[PDB]
């Protein structure tokens, strides 16, 4: 991880319920994409954040109207770990709040991506940042993902990161983006701990859902 820099990931959202519990991505003025296991009541979306603990004057805090978990989310296998959030009011898109394009195709192994979040910064230990953290990590091959996690990887998941360890997404990062060449290819989802050797992070494969997201946004 590193400090992204103020308002440098403009599509990054914090999900707040009295405190930061998850991340998300702005896909348009009124819709956020996040993880299904981030579903809570009383979600407030905070846009334009950097330091989630102080008010820096670029924020928009907007409550959620609707929160739509994928009809086939399996709580147990974590398959279809995707949820949409409709904002009560449309956001004002500016330079510090902008949305992320949805992919036309799926990204191949070895694509380097940006993963961002306010989650834990210690592999083992505890340290929650004030500011946004970023991490450049490659998409891993299906073959290696399935061998890292035998019998747990569905066609809707991918692995990303480093087999060596020390560089990963951690608790607090869920629902947050994995953006590869400007396109939203993943959502931070799960892993066996974090930044452990031979256990990369596991991400929801957003390219499989593009039709669902569009039609759902359209009819809600």
């Amino acid at each position: 991880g590193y400090t992204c820099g103020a308002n440098t990931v403009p599509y990054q959202v914090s999900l707040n319920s009295g405190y930061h519990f998850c991340g998300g991505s702005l896909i348009n003025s009124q819709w956020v994409v996040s993880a299904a296991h981030c579903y809570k009541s009383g979600i407030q979306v905070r846009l334009g954040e950097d330091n989630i603990n102080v008010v820096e004057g670029n924020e928009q805090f907007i409550s959620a109207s609707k929160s739509i978990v994928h009809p086939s989310y399996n709580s147990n296998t974590l398959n279809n770990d995707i949820m949409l959030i409709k904002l009560k009011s449309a956001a004002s898109l500016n330079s510090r709040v902008a949305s992320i394009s949805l992919p036309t195709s799926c990204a191949s192994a070895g694509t380097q991506c940006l993963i961002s979040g306010w989650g834990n910064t210690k592999s083992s230990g505890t340290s929650y940042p004030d500011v946004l953290k970023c991490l450049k990590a490659p998409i891993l091959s299906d073959s290696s993902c399935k061998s890292a996690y035998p019998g747990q990887i569905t066609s809707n998941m991918f692995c990303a990161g480093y087999l060596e360890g020390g560089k990963d997404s951690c608790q607090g990062d869920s629902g947050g983006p994995v953006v590869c060449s400007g396109k939203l290819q993943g959502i931070v989802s799960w892993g066996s701990g974090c930044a452990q050797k031979n256990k990369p992070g596991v991400y929801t494969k957003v390219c499989n859902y593009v039709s669902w997201i569009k039609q759902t946004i359209a009819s809600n």
Binding site: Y19, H20, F21, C22, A35, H37, C38, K40, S75, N76, L78, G119, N120, Y128, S169, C170, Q171, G172, D173, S174, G175, V188, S189, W190, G191, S192, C194, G201
Partner: protein, 56 residues
């Protein structure tokens, strides 16, 4: 309740949701970080729920 003695389980998912668990050693309900999935039973949404079910 036997599950009330069990250690807090964050699990594999990466959310940062504050929940409660019974801490036998301290004789009270304490907060921990729950990752958002595969919860075990020593995991409550309020102290009051925790105390009602576990407080012994």
């Amino acid at each position: 309740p036997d599950f009330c003695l069990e250690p807090p389980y964050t699990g594999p998912c990466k959310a940062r949701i504050i929940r409660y668990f019974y801490n036998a050693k301290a004789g009270l309900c304490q907060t921990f970080v729950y990752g958002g999935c595969r919860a075990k039973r020593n995991n409550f949404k309020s102290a009051e729920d925790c105390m009602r079910t576990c407080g012994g």
